[PDB]
Structure 1
Amino acid sequence: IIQHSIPAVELRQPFFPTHMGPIKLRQFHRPPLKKYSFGALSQPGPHSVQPLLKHIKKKAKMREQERQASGGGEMFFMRTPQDLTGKDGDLILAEYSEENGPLMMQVGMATKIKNYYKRKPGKDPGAPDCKYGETVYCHTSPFLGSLHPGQLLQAFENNLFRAPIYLHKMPETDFLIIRTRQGYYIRELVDIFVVGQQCPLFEVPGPNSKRANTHIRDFLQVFIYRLFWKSKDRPRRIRMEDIKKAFPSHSESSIRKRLKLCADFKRTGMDSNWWVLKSDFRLPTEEEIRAMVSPEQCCAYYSMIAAEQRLKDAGDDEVRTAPWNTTRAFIAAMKGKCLLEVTGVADPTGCGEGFSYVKIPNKDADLRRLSLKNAKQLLRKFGVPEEEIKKLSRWEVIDVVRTMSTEQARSGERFSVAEHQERYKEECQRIFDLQNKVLSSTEVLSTDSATGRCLKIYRTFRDEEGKEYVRCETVRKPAVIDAYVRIRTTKDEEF
């Protein structure tokens, strides 16, 4: 139902990167402000910002002319990368509550705003109207908690997640500066949503999983097909070091495995040092290449490799907070396989607000020989109420005495269903209500080793002319210690 932009469904590299290094995985979804080498902003000095208001209304009038020329219905406009600029259209901002979400949209992907509205019991006036999104009446709450009667909750809904959003007005001081190579541009913003804890609808694969390796192979194959489509020479031909520039972490055996079928290497003559396309091979059409890899699979892979980097940098609680575990836990809880402990360590807040998506399981002859009368006296002795003593049904009285039991054990030398499920359901609603209240609040908030052993390194270097000075350096930081000695221990084992 979600229709991404044509740059997004075709997996263009600017928007969907082929390879992300370690410093680019640490800055995942937090791209720093890069310095330009060539352009107008590359020259140092003051630079005028340029007000786009004529550009916004000219583009909106032009898109309305396009829509009314095409019959007046709803149209699809995002067909070019230049449609995805911030210089036109009605921009809103969307802030996230969690630091690192389990899933996150790439640039160019679409999402919808759904206003879930539970009617009041009996008569209700109608959904409180909202500026953005479409309204839907939800008897069955999409989220973990349940909506109150007469409560409208907006939410981002797409294929990746579903998350409750809360409209706030912008600060009176903040504007939005779009910088490109040519200059600065300024918009005002008026609407900013706060996005609550995401409910994941797509499962992030694990590292070295079968789905992970399948996505890597299919992504490389799609890139190879699109390089063959872009080739202008008739027997379409590509170069290997284009693919080695795109995927530099790949061993070249895997790239040659992808090129083995569908291409062959010409060493001599014409097309030399090129991988020409085989003449019997039909290059797949655009819709087949789109059916190979989906953009949401690329977002799940990017979430996996970013979480791999964060875990790797931070040396089992953290492993539980990894998105493959949490996405598997939430999707399994939605089918009803298992339950989740809603208070735990996978909690992205670190306090009582928010949920944690980690799996929890959903889980003597003589009494009959008592001869009713003595069983009556025994029920009187235990303190059983007089109603059960009064009915005096032999079988019921003995069953009640058996229920009373007396227990005991020792060696030498109890609901497991409704109560557990009910506690999980009520807690999910309580956490959901608490999360909604904290995020909605327009109230101003006031600004507010195991061994105990340090590391010392002595050394020996030679100075200019002739000298043999020795430097003793002490590292008191337990973080530098761990990374230092971990490498030293690994080296002790590299030989």
Structure 2
Amino acid sequence: IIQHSIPAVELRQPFFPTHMGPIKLRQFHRPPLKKYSFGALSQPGPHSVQPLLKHIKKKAKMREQERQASGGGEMFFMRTPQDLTGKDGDLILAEYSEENGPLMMQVGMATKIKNYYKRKPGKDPGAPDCKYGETVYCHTSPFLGSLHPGQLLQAFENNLFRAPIYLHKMPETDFLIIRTRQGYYIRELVDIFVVGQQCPLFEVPGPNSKRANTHIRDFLQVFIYRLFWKSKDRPRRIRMEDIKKAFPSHSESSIRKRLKLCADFKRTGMDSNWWVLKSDFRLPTEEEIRAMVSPEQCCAYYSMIAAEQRLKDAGYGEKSFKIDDEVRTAPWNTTRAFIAAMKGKCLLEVTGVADPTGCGEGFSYVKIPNKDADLRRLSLKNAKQLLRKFGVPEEEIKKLSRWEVIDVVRTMSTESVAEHQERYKEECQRIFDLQNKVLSSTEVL
């Protein structure tokens, strides 16, 4: 059960952007350092970098006092945008080994660490303790490969993806700098995780699909409703200009579709007009708006339009998405391949072109399906001598039922659907164990 922060669940801006340009899609989850037009740090010259140690201890004390005053147990603290800052609380860094993951969390979303451990045979004293995460004892492996007895494997867990994580040490030269309009902030941090290839749990849509087009419509319907809740006029009213500024890629006619059922147009003698909320329309409450669009659905759409921009930059037009190799690496292709393979509908390519590492250290998420005369002329005696020659044990030579003998010698001269799935498991296990070895190694290259 994942409980996101309140600005994440409330679909708030700029945590959930409404529209992203071609520049923003290339810079998706890589925000460039941008100058301010006003404020303290819009000025030239050196700027003070302030410590946080008193602020961290004070906030941790206050949150503990709020826990003990009602009167203990588990308390939810991520209620405001101010609570989501990096200025307070215990922090990690997480470095994704994938350049562009199929699913990505936004600022404000939540994830868990589960410490997957397979018990040793006989008398297990228990899993080793870790600084982070909750221990989960598993008999069936949640990954593509199987855990070994006594093996502890840390992993990120949320509604988007599953991916193994590896605790490393932050280098002694590297610090975390928090930069705002008001000043520079610095905190010490030692714990950094290397995150492997994701096992996606939520489906990424294709471009201009019915699911994708429903998501854009619903997200527009969510954004319109919260504009009415922001309006202080009685009766409530909004402007077309505010929606078009947030949604420059929509035509006004598509916005006219979403506004006709809930609002009435009142024209005024100025090029700035209002949509007045219908008196007989009950505006939906906050948690009803929450059920319309989830944070996980936005990330699946965000992954699509960013990857669609990357394919257009690579020369692939919309008619390409019989299929090209790079189009197979798209997240709408990889996640549909993996989830169907997770549900037992098909198997995976694993050694193939959709390997994100490019050197054999990852998985390729591409669907593959789940798919005598002369021996009987041997005239028992020569078949007996042949079974003696191959090294067949003397019991089978001794019984010498001739049909059984010829079936055994055909089997030995052979030495198919149980081998097909076993070779899939062998290929999965090899790269899984190889990925465990490389990304956890402290070798200096």
| TM-score normalized by the length of structure 1 | 0.81
Contact map agreement 1:320 1:346 (CA 8 A) in 2:
yes
In structure 2, the residue matched to 1:392 is: 400
Distance across 2 between alignment mates of 1:370 and 1:350: 51
Q: Measure, in 1, the Cα distance between the counterparts of 2:126 and 2:359.
A: 36
Q: Residues 93-104 of structure 1: matches in 2 within 5 Å?
A: 93-104=93-104
Tell me by how many angstroms 1:125 deviates.
2.5
| CA offset digits 1:362-387 (Å, max 9, x no partner) | 11999999999999999999999997
Q: How much does 1:339 deviate?
A: 0.6
Q: Does the 8 A contact of 2:239 with 2:272 survive in 1?
A: no
Displacement, 1:260? 1.2
Deviation at 1:86, TM superposition (A): 0.6
Contact 2:325 / 2:353 at 8 angstroms: preserved in 1?
yes
In 1, Cα distance between equivalents of 2:373 and 2:426: 42
**1:142 aligned residue:** 142
How far apart are 1:148 and its partner, in Å?
A: 0.9
The alpha-carbon distance between structure 1 residues 405 and 129, as it changes in their structure 2 partners (threshold 3 A), is closer
Q: Distance in 2 between matches of 1:269 and 1:199?
A: 57
Other-structure match for 2:358: 350
- Give the 3 Å change call, closer, same or farther, for CA 403–194 of structure 1 in structure 2: closer
Tell me the distance in 1 between the aligned counterparts of 2:183 and 2:39.
9
**What SS does the corresponding residue of 1:124 show, helix, strand or coil?**
coil
Runs of at least 5 residues in structure 2 that lack an aligned partner in the other structure: 315-323
Distance 1:58 1:372, change over 3 A: closer
SS state of the match for residue 42, structure 2? coil
1:178·1:186 contact (CA, 8 Å) conserved in 2? yes
Check 1:368–1:209 CA distance in 2 against 1; reply closer, same or farther (3 A cut). same
Rounded to whole Å, the distance in 2 between the matches of 1:108 and 1:265 is 36
Q: Distance in 1 between matches of 2:375 and 2:81?
A: 83
How has the CA–CA distance of structure 1 residues 235 and 353 changed in structure 2, closer, same or farther, with 3 Å as cutoff? same
Q: 1:352 to 1:402 in 2, by over 3 A?
A: closer
CA contact (8 A) 1:6 1:78 kept: yes
Q: Which moved more, 1:217-226 or 1:275-284?
A: 275-284
Structure 2 residue matching 1:222: 3-state secondary structure: helix
Q: Structure 1's 395 and 311: CA in aligned 2 closer, same or farther, altered over 3 A?
A: same
C-alpha separation in 2, matches of 1:379 and 1:169? 61
Q: Which moves more between the two structures, 386-395 or 93-102?
A: 386-395
Structure 1 residue 28: Cα displacement:
0.5
Residues 386 and 194 of structure 1: CA distance in aligned 2, closer, same or farther (over 3 Å): closer
**How far is the alpha carbon of 1:129 from its aligned partner?**
0.4
Q: Is the 8 A contact 1:266 1:272 kept in 2?
A: no
**Residues 61 and 399 of structure 1: CA distance in aligned 2, closer, same or farther (over 3 Å):** closer
- CA–CA separation in structure 2 for the residues paired with 1:387 and 1:10: 74
Per-residue CA deviations over 1:387-432 (Å, capped at 9, x if unaligned) read 76765647657877999999xxxxxxxxx41101001112111111
In the superposition, the TM-score normalised over structure 2's length comes to: 0.90
Please state if 1:266 is matched with 2:244.
no
The change in CA–CA distance for 1:177 and 1:363 in structure 2 (over 3 A counts) is: same
Check 1:396–1:17 CA distance in 2 against 1; reply closer, same or farther (3 A cut). same
Indicate how the Cα distance of structure 1 residues 45 and 252 shifts in structure 2: closer, same or farther if over 3 A, else same: same
Q: Distance in 2 between matches of 1:21 and 1:206?
A: 19
Question: The residue matched to 2:41 in structure 1 has which SS?
Answer: coil
Give distance in 2, aligned partners of 1:159 and 1:30: 22
Give 1:96 shift.
Answer: 0.6
What is the CA-CA distance between 1:7 and the residue it aligns to?
Answer: 0.3
Judged with a 3 Å threshold, the aligned counterparts in structure 2 of structure 1 residues 245 and 125 are, in CA distance, closer, same or farther, namely same
Contact 2:384 2:397 in 1 (8 A): yes
Structure-2 separation of matches of 1:379 and 1:304: 61
**Distance in 2 (alpha carbons) for counterparts of 1:383 and 1:438:** 42
User: Residue deviations 1:250-273, cap 9 Å, x none?
Assistant: 111111101111112112599982
**Which stretch of structure 1 is more off in the superposition, 296-305 or 378-387?**
378-387
Q: Are residue 129 (structure 1) and residue 129 (structure 2) matched? A: yes
1:136-215 alignment, distance < 5 Å: 136-215=136-215
After superposition, the C-alpha distances for 1:154-186 in whole angstroms (9 at most, x for unaligned) are 110000001100000110011111010011010
Matches within 5 A, 1:231-380: 231-268=231-268, 273-314=273-314, 316-363=324-371
Deviation string, structure 1 residues 207-232 (Cα, Å, up to 9, x no partner): 01111001000000000011111111
Structure 2 contact 346–367 (Cα < 8 Å) conserved: yes
Larger radius of gyration: 1
Match of 1:422 in 2: 422
Whether the 8 Å CA contact 1:156–1:165 is kept in 2: the answer is yes
Evaluate the alpha carbon distance shift between residue 398 and residue 131 of structure 1 in structure 2; reply closer, same or farther with a 3 A threshold.
closer
Aligned twin of 2:319: none
Q: Deviations over 1:447-481 (max 9, x none)?
A: xxxxxxxxxxxxxxxxxxxxxxxxxxxxxxxxxxx
**CA offsets per residue over residues 35-64 of structure 1, 9 Å max, x none?**
000000001111110111111111111111
CA separation of 1:103 and 1:402: change in aligned 2, threshold 3 A:
closer
Cα drift, residue 233 of structure 1: 1.0
- 1:432–1:375 CA distance, 2 compared to 1 (3 A): closer
Q: Residues of 2 paired with 1:91 and 1:367: CA distance?
A: 71
C-alpha distance in 2 between matches for 1:396 and 1:67:
75
CA gap 1:369/1:86 in 2 versus in 1, 3 angstroms: closer
Over the residues paired in the alignment, what is the CA RMSD in angstroms?
Answer: 4.0
- The 4+ residue runs of structure 1 with deviation greater than 4 A are 268-272, 364-406
Q: Tell me, yes or no, if the aligned pair for 1:346 and 1:357 is still in contact at 8 Å.
A: yes
The structure-2 alpha-carbon separation of the partners of 1:244 and 1:133, relative to structure 1 and needing over 3 Å to count, comes to same
Question: How big is each residue's C-alpha offset from its partner over 1:298-328, in whole Å with a ceiling of 9 and x where there is no partner?
Answer: 00100001000011100x0000000011001
Contact (CA 8 Å) 1:119, 1:149: kept in 2 or not? yes
Quote the Cα distance in structure 2 between the aligned partners of 1:141 and 1:93.
Answer: 26
Whether the aligned pair in 2 keeps the contact of 1:240 and 1:275 (CA below 8 Å) is yes
What is the distance in 1 between the residues matched to 2:436 and 2:408? 47
Taking structure 1 as reference, are residues 275 and 367 closer, same or farther at Cα in structure 2, changes over 3 Å only?
Answer: same
Offset, 1:341: 1.4
Distance 1:293 1:374, change over 3 A: same
**C-alpha spacing 1:273/1:325, structure 2 compared with 1 (3 Å):** same
CA distance in 2, matches of 1:380, 1:124: 47
- 8 Å contact 2:356–2:363 — kept in the other structure? yes
SS of 2:132 mapped into structure 1: coil
Distance verdict in 2 for CA 1:129–1:241, change over 3 Å? same
Q: Is the 8 A contact 1:103 1:200 kept in 2?
A: yes
Pick closer, same or farther for the CA change 1:22–1:398 going to 2, 3 Å: same
Q: For residues 149 and 408 of structure 2, what CA distance do their matches in structure 1 show?
A: 43
1:472 equivalent in structure 2: none
